Amino acid sequence: STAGKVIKCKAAVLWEEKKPFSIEEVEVAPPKAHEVRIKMVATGICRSDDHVVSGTLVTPLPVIAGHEAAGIVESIGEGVTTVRPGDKVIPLFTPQCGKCRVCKHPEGNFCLKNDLSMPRGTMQDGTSRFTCRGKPIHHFLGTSTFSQYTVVDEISVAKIDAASPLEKVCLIGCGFSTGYGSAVKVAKVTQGSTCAVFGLGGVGLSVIMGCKAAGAARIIGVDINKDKFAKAKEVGATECVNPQDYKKPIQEVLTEMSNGGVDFSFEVIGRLDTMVTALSCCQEAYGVSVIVGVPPDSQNLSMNPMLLLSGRTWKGAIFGGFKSKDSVPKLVADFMAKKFALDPLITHVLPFEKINEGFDLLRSGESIRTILTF
Amino acid sequence: STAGKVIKCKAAVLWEEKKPFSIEEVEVAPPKAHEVRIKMVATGICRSDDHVVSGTLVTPLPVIAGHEAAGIVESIGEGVTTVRPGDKVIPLFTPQCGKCRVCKHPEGNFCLKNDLSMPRGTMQDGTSRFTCRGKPIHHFLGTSTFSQYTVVDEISVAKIDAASPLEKVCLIGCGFSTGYGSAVKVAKVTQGSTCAVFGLGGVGLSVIMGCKAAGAARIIGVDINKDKFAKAKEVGATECVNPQDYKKPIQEVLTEMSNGGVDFSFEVIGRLDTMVTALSCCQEAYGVSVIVGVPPDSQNLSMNPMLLLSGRTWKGAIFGGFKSKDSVPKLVADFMAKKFALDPLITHVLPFEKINEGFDLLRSGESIRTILTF
Ligand SMILES: NC(=O)C1=CN([C@@H]2O[C@H](COP(=O)(O)OP(=O)(O)OC[C@H]3O[C@@H](n4cnc5c(N)ncnc54)[C@H](O)[C@@H]3O)[C@@H](O)[C@H]2O)C=CC1
Ligand SMILES: NC(=O)C1=CN([C@@H]2O[C@H](COP(=O)(O)OP(=O)(O)OC[C@H]3O[C@@H](n4cnc5c(N)ncnc54)[C@H](O)[C@@H]3O)[C@@H](O)[C@H]2O)C=CC1
Ligand SMILES: O=CNC1CCCCC1
Ligand SMILES: O=CNC1CCCCC1
Ligand SMILES: [Co+2]
Ligand SMILES: [Co+2]
Ligand SMILES: [Zn+2]
Ligand SMILES: [Zn+2]
Fold it and tell me: How far is the CA of B132 from the centre of ligand 6 (A)?
């Protein structure tokens, strides 16, 4: 009774930076060719969504943000072959077109159809499916999950197990997969190694999960909020350090602790200074450091290249290095086989209508992941 | 008839920065415990030696520089077990103590006994074996090969094949192994890939040799001295570009030429700007860039960490990543089995007494490697 028709529903519109989300009626157009309209069931509150509000991450406004989510297909456009109405799905903020040089490469996942490098805030065809107060509203990363209904391109959606608990597996759409894959796929943490994880939010906890699953012997959590330490130890940290407790720079502290530097370090905050600190604390001849956190837009860091000349490796990744459409269904299957846990990441549950309360919980430092239910 | 007693011989002493070498008589003390005194046979002129003259590379002066060489053992100190008088040897500017955490690691080579991170300019025991006009003269990287005789610690020397042609395999002591290993071992260049090599001197030509040996389909040489292009194509470059010929920045040019970025790039010059350019020109989702050139002392570069977050890998290495004492004898043995060629790197052969002329050739852009013969 809605297929082929405009849907009127509620969404959280961000009209301007540094303001609350506005929950209002929007019109959602029906899917065009190779597009999928999804009834949202659950969406997580990720720090990257907050970066849009704060201006850290620039994308066209007004916008419907949200990118970590799960829902049920309401209708499909012409030509769609990979999902059907009623299928459980996870939208993919990094697409998998399957046809570009990255999608065809054995290791890359930053598909050239992404909307991150040069954000337009549209569908792949350059237009919007959202209207509000007579105005077109932009999409975000081709997902826009802060809405009861969204429309995504087929290359930005993955079908998942029909028995999946959507209020939990939405985290596989961003936070969990990003952190876990950064450890197991990007760094390729080795058995018995020493790791340092800077930032113990949802993504940093998922990095710790991956480091533990890879068999690391020591996992040192680093955060300026000591209230984060208890959960970090629960999921695998052997030790936690607060840089504010020390008179020396923390890279010196970590270097003494690891008897000359860690095997693998991870920046999971989004600060230029901690990216350089994390690189410095890995062992100078063979350490690996992975940037996961997103820094403020268009800001350069300063570093001494002799840190690399001695033998260090420095890399970054989006979405844990996972090719999104291949990997998301396998990760859900793994969760359904109890190969990893997601409950440790979920600290709060709220109805979607309280999205602003959910963001203030994140900003206050109190929450890890708040899951919003539609 | 020289064992146990001081040797008078000629050496090229650098008394202060930005002066010609002074060829004069020095006194070489006999080797102490676990030290080796070597009669030099041939030594190459590497840009890193010129960095000492210019002050780009800071090390205590006055000094006997030189680190790319081959010679014959004159006498050994008490406790030496890995070489004997009469053995052909290559001094190692990166030692291999075999006992530190790096030496025991399967993939590291920057031995913690190195004299590069905080140069002292001495033997491992903190003293000098060189005297000139009654003044003590510092060592360089534990090698000091610009002398008819030098003394090195046993962890800084490798025994090589008794049949080795010393006037060619001296390049295995630095330039060739550094460039070749940067490609085959550090970058791990793959068959069919596209490579970009910035700097077509002795080390950059060896990088090209390594990329070709690894089966790269395209190898783009980058140099502002177009006189370097002919030799670069001889050893494997498919094409060469001079940044001064373009109105656009060269990372944009290389990205367009490679239809979206190269698989592997190498900075083999020693400039901060080309380090960042070489990183930018590799493919944003899966490219790898290796820093080989040495930056000027105590200078930081500036870069956008979003270059790494998209998926690039940035790394550096000393001596091609080779564990020095294990690898140098195998590389000589490989040379002897005709596995690679060294003659294309040698453009000039001069007597040791013409060391200053050899440096003038390097500074003028005319030479690749000048080999000095004693
Ligand atoms: N590369 C990718 O694909 C993705 C990147 N991100 C980015 O990952 C980063 C982390 O995201 P979340 O875990 O959701 O954020 P979060 O805000 O929940 O966790 C950040 C943690 O860093 C701590 N912290 C802040 N400043 C610190 C400092 N100077 N030193 C030590 N710790 C500090 C905070 O106390 C906090 O616990 C964000 O920048 C996010 O935008 C998130 C998902 C995907
Ligand atoms: N990582 C390691 O273990 C080692 C590092 N090195 C360093 O490698 C670098 C290269 O050494 P060599 O091949 O002996 O030096 P070289 O002086 O023979 O070659 C440098 C080349 O770079 C070119 N060049 C200079 N400025 C340029 C610019 N702005 N843009 C493009 N090209 C430019 C020059 O024309 C020249 O052909 C040096 O910095 C050396 O100190 C050398 C050996 C070992
Ligand atoms: O958190 C989800 N996506 C992120 C990926 C890194 C750039 C900012 C957006
Ligand atoms: O060229 C030989 N050794 C180099 C290695 C990199 C730092 C400067 C010295
Ligand atoms: Co996210
Ligand atoms: Co050298
Ligand atoms: Zn693609
Ligand atoms: Zn060692």
Answer: 25
Check the annotation: does B105 bind a ligand: no
Pairing of the two strands A35-44 and A7-14: unpaired
Give catalytic status of residue A22 as yes or no: no
Q: What residues are paired with B355 via a beta bridge?
A: none
Pairing of β A264-267 and β A194-198? parallel
Clarify whether B67 is annotated catalytic: yes
A247 CB burial (10 A radius; 0-12, 13-18, 19+): exposed
For residue A129, give both structure tokens.
Answer: 């499916």
Could you tell me which residues of chain B have a Cβ less than 8 Å from any Cβ in chain A? 101-102, 105, 107-110, 112, 117, 259-260, 272, 275, 283-286, 291, 294-295, 298-306, 308-318, 321
| Top-tier CATH class for B176-320 | alpha beta
Q: Is B174 a catalytic residue?
A: yes
What is the least distance, in Å, from the CA of A72 to any CA of chain B? 30
How many angstroms does the Cα of residue A271 sit away from the middle of ligand 1?
Answer: 9
Respond yes or no: is residue A265 known to be catalytic. no
- How many C-beta atoms surround the C-beta of residue B338 within 10 A? 7
Nearest CB to B311: which of A308, A312, A316?
Answer: A316
Helix or strand (DSSP H, E) at A206: helix A202-213
Residue B286: which of A105, A307, A314 has the nearest Cβ?
A105
Q: Is the CB of A271 under 6 A from ligand 1?
A: yes
Using CB atoms within 10 Å of the CB of residue B313, give its burial: 0 to 12 exposed, 13 to 18 middle, 19+ buried: buried
Residue partners of B176: CB distance under 8 A and separation at least 6: B202, B206, B209, B331, B340, B342, B345
| Contact (CB<8Å) B102/A310 | no
Region of residue B77 (left: phi > 0; alpha: psi -120 to 50; beta: else): beta
Per-residue CA distances from A317 to A59, A83, A114, A321, B265 (Å): 20, 28, 14, 6, 19
Amino acid B96 reads Q
Resolution of the experimental model, in Å, one decimal: 1.6
CA angle A154, A159, A164 (to 5 degrees): 150
Ligand nearest to the CA of A171: 5
Q: Do residues B24 and B13 lie in contact, with contact meaning Cβ atoms separated by under 8 Å?
A: yes
Pairing mode of beta strands B130-132, A88-91: unpaired
What Rg, from alpha-carbon coordinates, does chain B have? 20
Could you tell me how many CB contacts below 8 A there are between chain A and chain B?
A: 126
User: Chain B interface, mutation test: which of A308, A312, A322, most B Cβ atoms within 10 Å?
Assistant: A308
Does A106 sit behind a cis peptide bond, omega within 30 degrees of 0 on the bond before it? no
- Count of CA atoms in the C-beta half-sphere (13 A) of B145: 32
- Which ligand is located closest to the Cα atom of residue A99? 7
Method: X-ray
Q: Which residue has the tokens 């459980």?
A: A88
